[PDB]
Amino acid sequence: EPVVGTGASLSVELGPRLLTSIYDGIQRPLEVIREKTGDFIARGVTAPALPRDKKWHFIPKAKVGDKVVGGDIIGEVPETSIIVHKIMVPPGIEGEIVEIAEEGDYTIEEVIAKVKTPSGEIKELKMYQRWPVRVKRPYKEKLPPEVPLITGQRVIDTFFPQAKGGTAAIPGPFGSGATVTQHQLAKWSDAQVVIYIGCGERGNEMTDVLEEFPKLKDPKTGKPLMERTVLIANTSNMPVAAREASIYTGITIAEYFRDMGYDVALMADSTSRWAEALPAYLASKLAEFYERAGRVVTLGSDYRVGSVSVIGAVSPPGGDFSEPVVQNTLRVVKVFWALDADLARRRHFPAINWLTSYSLYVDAVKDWWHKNIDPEWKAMRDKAMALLQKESELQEIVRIVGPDALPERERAILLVARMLREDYLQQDAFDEVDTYCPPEKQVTMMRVLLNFYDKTMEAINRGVPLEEIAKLPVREEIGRMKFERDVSKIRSLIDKTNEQFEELFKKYGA
Numbered sequence: 001e002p003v004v005g006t007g008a009s010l011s012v013e014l015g016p017r018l019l020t021s022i023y024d025g026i027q028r029p030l031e032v033i034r035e036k037t038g039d040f041i042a043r044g045v046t047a048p049a050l051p052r053d054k055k056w057h058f059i060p061k062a063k064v065g066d067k068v069v070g071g072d073i074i075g076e077v078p079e080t081s082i083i084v085h086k087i088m089v090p091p092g093i094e095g096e097i098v099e100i101a102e103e104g105d106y107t108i109e110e111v112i113a114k115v116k117t118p119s120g121e122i123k124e125l126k127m128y129q130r131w132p133v134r135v136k137r138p139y140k141e142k143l144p145p146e147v148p149l150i151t152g153q154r155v156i157d158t159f160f161p162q163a164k165g166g167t168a169a170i171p172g173p174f175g176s177g178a179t180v181t182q183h184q185l186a187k188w189s190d191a192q193v194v195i196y197i198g199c200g201e202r203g204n205e206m207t208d209v210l211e212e213f214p215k216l217k218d219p220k221t222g223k224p225l226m227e228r229t230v231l232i233a234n235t236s237n238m239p240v241a242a243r244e245a246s247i248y249t250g251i252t253i254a255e256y257f258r259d260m261g262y263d264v265a266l267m268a269d270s271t272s273r274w275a276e277a278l279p280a281y282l283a284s285k286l287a288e289f290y291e292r293a294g295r296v297v298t299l300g301s302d303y304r305v306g307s308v309s310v311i312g313a314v315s316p317p318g319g320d321f322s323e324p325v326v327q328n329t330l331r332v333v334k335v336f337w338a339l340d341a342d343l344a345r346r347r348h349f350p351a352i353n354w355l356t357s358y359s360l361y362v363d364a365v366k367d368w369w370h371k372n373i374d375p376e377w378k379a380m381r382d383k384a385m386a387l388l389q390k391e392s393e394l395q396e397i398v399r400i401v402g403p404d405a406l407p408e409r410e411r412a413i414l415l416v417a418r419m420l421r422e423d424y425l426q427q428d429a430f431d432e433v434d435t436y437c438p439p440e441k442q443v444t445m446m447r448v449l450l451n452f453y454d455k456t457m458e459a460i461n462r463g464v465p466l467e468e469i470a471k472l473p474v475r476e477e478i479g480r481m482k483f484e485r486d487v488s489k490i491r492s493l494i495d496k497t498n499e500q501f502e503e504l505f506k507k508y509g510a
Contacts, residue, residue: 015128025246037241071299165295172313173200258306391417
């Protein structure tokens with residue numbers, strides 16, 4: 001069907017079987033064909049988004065007589081072994097449930113409920129709904145950033161945190177082999193659902209994502225990661241129009257999962273100039289995309305919260321990073337994790353530059369850390385950063401005049417900053433233990449390091465040579481603590497540090 005005014009009604013279907021699916025930017029299944037854009041309209045007569053032949057187990061949640069509003073949960077469909085699909089009343093629909101399907105098996109075109117609206121109108125409800133991708137799904141309230149998206153990656157969670165509902169950028173493309181943060185984020189972030197727009201896809205980078213993603217295991221469950229993932233593919237052969245539409249299709253599907261009460265992570269990939277469809281107005285529209293991120297009290301009769309957190313890849317034409325697409329993206333995002341080729345070459349992993357990255361969410365999430373994890377989280381983070389800033393200043397100077405004239409105190413700062421970089425920032429994504437670092441382990445590791453700092457400065461303030469501190473036996477254990485899964489063992493290193501230093505205080509006197 002046609003449509004008057006701007007918008008040829010570009011829409012997406014939302015309901016069972018979104019998970020495990022692979023689509024183009026216009027929600028047609030894997031390896032499907034061509035459409036074209038404009039300030040107006042677009043075409044398409046090809047393939048269906050959700051299979052109409054699949055039988056789903058529907059469990060009714062509401063009953064005849066219940067009053068309902070848009071967003072209310074009227075049933076449950078176990079969609080994969082990981083995710084229960086929540087069947088919701090579409091937005092704009094409210095009234096009395098006059099008819100609802102018994103528990104059993106149904107295809108998505110079967111009417112599973114009917115609602116009588118205030119005026120008497122009878123509306124038929126199915127397991128899916130449709131929504132225009134260019135219209136933000138509505139919600140009751142957008143909440144201020146408050147709760148961290150816990151990534152389990154120390155540098156991110158500690159120094160450059162993402163809020164649930166927040167917006168982050170990282171240098172792209174995702175399919176890049178020089179780093180693995182992009183993948184760590186997808187599997188470890190405490191979002192239940194991942195919407196992934198593999199869009200830096202060109203050459204073998206397409207078929208890389210095709211044959212490996214059904215094999216990737218969700219480490220939280222042992223089950224396949226695809227079972228909580230919707231994949232959306234932008235290839236170089238695809239119509240530039242479907243590739244422009246791709247992120248709206250993505251974000252709309254994400255919003256749909258947040259509406260159920262899930263936290264969702266939208267990961268957007270990019271090669272150079274991912275668009276050509278539709279002045280500075282472009283910058284203003286990318287802005288509108290990012291503004292659709294958020295944690296919200298959702299529609300429904302029950303108080304209910306879900307979120308979409310956005311992580312966008314940023315890869316500029318020349319890779320100098322003063323190009324428009326990077327200026328525009330970095331203007332609206334609240335977090336930037338600066339992947340740094342020089343860090344990577346030195347095999348400092350993850351290769352996140354801790355001087356040029358930033359998060360504007362630190363104060364927003366500090367209270368959740370303080371109340372749930374550690375009362376000193378923010379103070380500790382600021383202290384370790386101050387150490388890292390100092391380190392950088394000292395290295396600059398030492399590049400000019402050399403290290404021979406350094407006082408013990410400055411060498412001590414370099415010693416402890418080095419321990420910070422090696423024992424805390426660096427993290428081993430390939431290790432069965434250090435691949436994820438629980439909040440509780442992060443703070444305890446930090447306490448160990450900062451206590452080591454306090455004791456180093458105190459000890460040199462008492463004329464203990466630094467050389468004696470650099471070789472304190474506990475240092476080796478502090479270096480290995482990221483590999484320890486038992487946090488109480490890590491914690492014990494504080495007392496162990498204290499007494500070793502005591503043996504040092506006695507071996508020197510006064």
